[PDB]
Structures are given as C-alpha cells and as structure tokens.
C-alpha cells in the first residue's frame, strides 16, 4: 500500500510539472504514460479528442503499473503454497483496483 501511495505521489509530481502537455521524441508510451500523466486540457486533445487526448484511460496505466509491480515483486512458483502468497497476490490485486478507481474518479 505504501508503494501504491508513493506511485500516487509520484503522479502528483507529474501533475505539478505539466504546463505544456506536448509529446516529444522518446515519448512512445504516451498512449498510457502520457494519458496517466495527462496535463490540463489542451486544444489538440480537445472535445473531439475525448477518447484520444481527454480519454479516461486508467486500464492501460493500471496494467503497466501491475507489470512494474510484478517485475519488482516476482512471485515464486511455491511462494503461494502458504496463506502469505495468496494474501500478497490479493493485496496486489486490491491495490491495483484501488489505484484504478482513484484514477477513474480523477479521470475528468
């Protein structure tokens, strides 16, 4: 949960420093990282960009965060043999669901 909170705080830091939400070279994750780090409403991502620029895209950002958490916490094959592995997997799923709900509630 602390890690999830840190990620939220990290996202808040991006929200502190997003004056011009312009894509650049090396921003190839801008469909999800540019969407989860989406700045205030620009003219390019206008009302016609309600699925491209103003798209509420919490599922792809949640999948990327779940992949990063699974890379940082790689479960063993017999790690779920006791209740600790199932509790850790359920806690990771609940943290991803809470982050997705907080992103969808904050997605416009």
């Amino acid at each position: 949960g602390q890690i999830c909170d840190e990620a939220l705080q990290y996202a808040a830091r991006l929200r502190e420093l997003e004056p011009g939400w312009s894509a650049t070279p090396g921003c190839q994750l801008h469909d999800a990282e540019q969407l989860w780090l989406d700045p205030l409403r620009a003219q390019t991502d206008e009302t016609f960009l309600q699925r491209r620029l103003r798209g509420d895209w919490p599922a792809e950002v949640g999948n990327r965060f779940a992949n990063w958490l699974n890379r940082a916490v790689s479960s063993d094959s017999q790690i779920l043999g006791s209740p600790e592995a199932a509790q850790w997997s359920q806690e990771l799923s609940k943290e991803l669901t809470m982050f997705k709900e907080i992103l969808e509630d904050e997605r416009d």
């Binding site: 190839q28 994750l29 469909d31 699925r51």
Partner: protein, 334 residues
Amino acid sequence: ILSTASVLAFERKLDPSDALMSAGAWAQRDASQEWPAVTVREKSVRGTISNRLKTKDRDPAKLDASIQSPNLQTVDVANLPSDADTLKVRFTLRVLGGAGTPSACNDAAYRDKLLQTVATYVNEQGFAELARRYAHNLANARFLWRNRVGAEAVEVRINHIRQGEVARTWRFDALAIGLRDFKADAELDALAELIASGLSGSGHVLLEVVAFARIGDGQEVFPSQELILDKGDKKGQKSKTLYSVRDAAAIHSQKIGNALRTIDTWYPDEDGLGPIAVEPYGSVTSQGKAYRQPKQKLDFYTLLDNWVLRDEAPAVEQQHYVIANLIRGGVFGE
C-alpha cells in the same frame, strides 16, 4: 560411468526457405515464371464490440456508450488479383544428412554412445519410414496452412535440382493424398528414396517445391502474421501485420518446417486425430494441450535417456519419434 551431457545441441536437417507467394490463372501453371507476386496492402476495419465482456453487468447504458465508439483499426491484407484464381507458393528445401551428430556437447563418452545408438538405428533400418512421412507432407500441400482449407484443386510440383538445371520432376494432386493416413505410391516412393538418400549422407538434396491452389478470383490468401508493437496509435497496422520478403507476401520458413515434420502418429492419447508435429512433450499450440506428457514415459527426453543410458531401446515407433526429434534439432540441456 556415463550420464547425459549438460549441453547438447543439434542443428536442424530439412531446412526450408521462406515460401514466396505469387498469383496466376489455372492451366497457366506450366508457364508460371512471370507470375506477379501477391502484394500486401492495407485497409481500415471498424467494428462493434464482439468479444465476451464480463456478463451479468446490470449497466446496458455503458454498453451502448461503448457501442458508439467504432474503435477504428488498420489491418494488413493480402488478396489475389481479380483476374487470377490460382495461388502459387514456391520455396526450396535442402536435405543434408548427419542427423545423429550434435553441434555442441559436453561429454565425449555420451557423445560417442549417442552416435553409436543412432548408428545402430540406421543399421536396423534406414530413414525410409521418416523420409516416407516427410515425402507425404511434401506431397500434400500441408505447408499451405489456411491457403489449403477450402481449395478446389491443389497441385504440387517438386523439382530435384542436381546441377543448375532440373534433374527430376514429381507431380502430385495434394487433395488426393490425405492429411490423415500415410499411403504408398511409386513416384512417392521414389521421392522418399531421394529424401532418404539425402538424410543418410549419401548425397546432397535440394528440392524446389511449387504449390498451386485454386481458390478463386480476388480471394484472400493467408501469409504469416508478424508481431505488432503497441506503442503506436490506432493507425499504422495497429491490429495486424503480414510477413513479406521484398514486395511479396510470404510464409515464415519455420511455418513450412512445422508443417513438414507433422508426422507424429505415435502419441499415446489418441490416433484418430491424425499426425502432429514432432516435439519433446509433443504439443500443439491450437489445443493448448500436451501429448507425450512426461507423467507417461513417452516424452522425447525420457525415451532418449532410457535408450542411451540404460540401453532400454523403446518400440520402433518411439525410435522413429526420437530420430525425428533429432532431425528436428533443438537445445537439449538443463
């Protein structure tokens, strides 16, 4: 004392090339050298949601809101021309020999034991059963995977090319020879004898395989599908990319190789399904299931370990399966 080597690698025999696609009219196939190649093109595809979502969702309003997004994609496609009904798929297959010798190995004693085990396999019988099954898979156009399904007439021309010119020709009806059982025919037995002479190291075999499939005017052919990145947008082949050699639709050579070694009719679960491709824990990706499951003692690794270490030579069908796996090649090690 003797144990299996920790590294043990075999180069593949029966190397096929990438299979190129061209198009033409039927009965023009004897002048099918200037036939134009099948070009891969783009098109747009917009469709309503069709995949099974989480059912019993009591919100039809969000469902209708998702339906008003046409989720536009760009898709690679490859069709025949409107004035051509025949797809011509051409490749070459090289048969080398030396199918027992590894390319890399740790133990020399295990290497010599394996070499003499394959040597006793060759002395008991030649490669004639395996070359017969490979010649059957050459005879029917199994390497046309979805370009064979629903074809009116499939014809296979196989040229043995000894010098720079053609040394022999075989002509087959691929719909006469089934994809199910392994038959006998004198031209097919001669082709199997040539493949067996290549696999036995007594010659150098190069074959040119041409397949004509009468599909229809402007119908859709199926080349190999590439891998697509997701960092792009909904354009630029966002859903499907098709494999191509230079301005020509083509098939991956490993697809041709998979369809060539679909000879395994000895797996213990069933025999009414037909052959599968030779694999350790012989498994097909379509069914998501493993025949030659290692709880049963019929996978490639336990059979080779019992044959080489404990001298427990298996049944002759399983010996055919083990030598077919060694012709397939692989990385066998811890």
